[PDB]
From a paper:
Single-stranded RNA bacteriophages (ssRNA phages) are positive-sense RNA viruses that have shown specificity for gram-negative bacteria by exploiting host retractile pili, including T4P6. Acinetobacters have type IV pili (T4P), which are involved in twitching motility, surface adhesion, biofilm formation, and natural transformation in gram-negative bacteria. Our study delves into the interaction between Acinetobacter phage AP205 and type IV pili.
To investigate the recognition mechanism between AP205 and T4P, we employed single-particle cryo-EM to obtain a structure of the AP205/T4P complex. The two copies of Mat exhibit different conformations: One Mat (referred as outer Mat) extends further to elevate its apical domain away from the capsid shell while the other Mat (referred as inner Mat) is embedded deeper within the capsid and has a larger bending angle between the central and basal domains. Within the T4P-Mat complex, the apical domain of each Mat specifically plugs into the groove formed by three adjacent pilin subunits within the T4P (referred to as Pilins 1, 2). Apparently, glycosylation at these two serines can prevent binding of AP205 Mat. It is likely that the substoichiometric glycosylation of pilins allows AP205 to bind to unglycosylated sites on the T4P. We also observed that the internal cleavage site of Pilin 3 at Ser79 is located at the binding interface for the apical domain. This cleavage allows Ser79 to move ~13 Å away from Gly78, allowing its interaction with β8 of the Mat. In the natural environment, during the interaction of AP205 with A.gp16, it is plausible that multiple T4P from the same cell come into close proximity.
Author numbering:
A (entry chain a): 147 to 195
B (entry chain a): 1 to 49
C (entry chain BD), E (entry chain AZ), G (entry chain BA), H (entry chain AS), I (entry chain BB), J (entry chain BE), ...: 79 to 147
D (entry chain AH), F (entry chain AI), L (entry chain AG): 9 to 78
The structure:
């Protein structure tokens, strides 16, 4: 979950950490952890075309 | 070469988002807040981010 | 007293039907309650992820610290 | 005194406000742990059945019905 | 009961009929299983060479280390 | 003042009428749960004796007395 | 102590003397048990095929998940 | 001070002997109590199912909100 | 922390060095314990056959059902 | 402000050291108290059993119903 | 909510990545805390050898019996 | 009822101060035993290979990957 | 996987090349293993005479009776 | 109304903002107060420890017993 920032701040109204998607309610990307992500191991090798 | 790499397009809206309604009822960065359910945000903004 | 129908008309239980529903226990004041809160509601919402939290529609001053949203 | 009784109200407010440790994650893990042991026990009979070459209908299964639907 | 047909609806056995066909034992959660993990399946698949492994579709935090994909 | 003491008495009466959440169900399920483990704990002894062919008297039970008589 | 006779009066063992009769391990509550379930019984029954199952005479409220029969 | 007999005769304990009878804890006013309620009794009863309720013989205008029955 | 040498002075372990002597786990109250039970002891003894039992030196009202002996 | 050393001389604490002694909280009147009760004392004592009782050397007519002893 | 990052500001966790470093759960008072304890901290010390201990920076009186050191 | 809520807090404080057993040895001892079985199961393969005279490359190993890396 | 090379990097096989040297099956913990013993090894050494024995680098409290050498 | 701002100009309360300052409730006489005591004040201050005391600037004869400096 980790991160939710580096998103589209458009629409949100930034008040410090607060991003007011409404006049009354806000969000904090630091803890807006609705985002599950994924990472994988990768074995790689450089190639010459 | 083993290499941990993040996996894009495998992320999901897990629903952990907890938007907060500032009890001040305005864009004040301070003041008490009401951590609400993820239902209060437009899904379009969620998809954009 | 069962979850579907309880023994008190002021107590209602929201029983989830699948893995995506959010449980809620709602209690409407009355009888011996104050006149001001004769029809207010106190709800404990349970997110499907396993998070319990409280909410109520009554004044913020009258909310306790735990149910202070 | 009124100050004494008001404090008791606050204590109940404080005490009932304990955080829930999300016991749903704890319970679910045990059920999965229970199931895999049951399905794990079916490995020996299937392995022995395959190594003898017997058909699926001929392979006697000593499986007992599980309350978690296996 | 048998590999072809079992006495439980939620337990299915994928018995191979050839030397190059794998074996799988899959069970679907239900009845007294958790509502959150309901209808999910855990399968123990057997390679034709005799290698046993476990797989499941339950959430990452609910997967035991022995069946982690 | 008389009114401030009346608030104290009413709060005490309000507190004294807290609902009792039927604690009989919780312990009874747990008490059966402990006995549930005791009865199943002797299955291994019985299963071996039946398969080994021991008689009822020839089967040695490692049972310790339980305060629940289960 | 033995299957023929146990060291506790509330614990009884039904040993199968043949191949066509079942076995029973019956435990009767009491002593430190609750008054509401003071005289109820919980039993383990095993078929001659070797299949074990749980049974009890207690109310459905008190019945565990594995003995809902 | 045991359930069979109390320290003072103004407090009585009805201890259930089986699972089909209700318990009662009855207390009678007196001594330093008001003269007009010198012989009234305040009793707590417990149903066999495990429900606790209050009852008293005092007039309605002296009853608390919890024993208005 | 060994059986011969434990890490706390209030914990006593009697290890059977022969097949005919018993094992015992003795724990004496104190420090943060109640002053009434400041110097009492609670012991768990094991017969050489492998049977466990609990004994306690506190008053009967302080004795739980488990160590009521 | 501790039990061993009180803030003022008008309050004295009898803190027991073992399980056989009794706790007592003695408060001697004075300062702004009435001239007649200038040198009277009021004490709250606790038995080792865990029972609290009140005693006061003030006149009978000045004893409230709480400490009618 | 993971060990690396938590959903609450007041909680931080030192995850032991090796066999020679200790684990600790740090919870810093705040939000609805008492004014005297706006900035005190308590930790759950987990030694690498398997020992759990608790320490706090609060005053001596506020320390519970389980965290007196 | 100020004194009553103290007993509630005191019991919780006492209960929160329960001695947590050192469970680390239990898992580590059990984990090695799982390696004990896994490592010793290849002795038959190793002993048969040595006695037949095959080399290291000629010794067919029916090893299965272990989550404990043992 | 073979004796010369295996499919697990934590599993090491020391196959003898003559009749005078000894064989060894060495396995290194990790992944799902404990943090304390994350880098320890368990090895099976076979003498040229055909005797099998075990050794391990873990602490004494984790050494089983099999490898307690 | 509120601690920060009150509905009467004759009542002020000093609310602490940290743990190193004291709280106080201050009230100044006026309107219906006597001309001699028309402009002094009565204060209720709370120490950082949490101790409440009363003080007043009125003459010694007008001071109550509990507010004697």
């Amino acid at each position: 979950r980790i991160d939710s920032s580096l998103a589209s701040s458009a629409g949100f109204v930034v008040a410090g950490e607060r991003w007011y998607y409404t006049k009354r309610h806000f969000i904090i990307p630091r803890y807006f952890q609705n985002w599950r992500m994924r990472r994988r191991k990768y074995v790689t090798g450089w190639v010459m075309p | 070469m083993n290499m941990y790499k993040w996996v894009p397009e495998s992320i999901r809206d897990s629903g952990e988002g907890q938007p907060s309604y500032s009890n001040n009822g305005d864009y004040a960065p301070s003041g008490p807040w009401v951590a609400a359910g993820i239902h209060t945000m437009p899904q379009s903004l969620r998809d954009s981010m | 007293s069962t979850a579907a129908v309880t023994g008190q008309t002021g107590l209602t239980i929201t029983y989830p039907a699948s893995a995506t529903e959010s449980a809620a226990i709602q209690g409407t004041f009355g009888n011996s309650a104050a006149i001001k809160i004769k029809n207010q509601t106190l709800t404990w919402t349970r997110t499907p992820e396993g998070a319990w939290s409280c909410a109520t529609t009554v004044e913020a001053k009258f909310k306790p610290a735990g149910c202070a949203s | 005194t009124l100050i004494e009784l008001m404090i008791v109200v606050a204590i109940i407010g404080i005490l009932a406000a304990i955080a829930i440790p999300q016991y749903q994650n704890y319970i679910a893990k045990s059920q999965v742990s229970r199931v895999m042991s049951e399905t794990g026990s079916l490995k020996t009979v299937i392995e022995t059945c395959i190594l003898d070459g017997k058909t699926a209908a001929n392979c006697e299964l000593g499986w007992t019905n599980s309350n978690l639907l296996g």
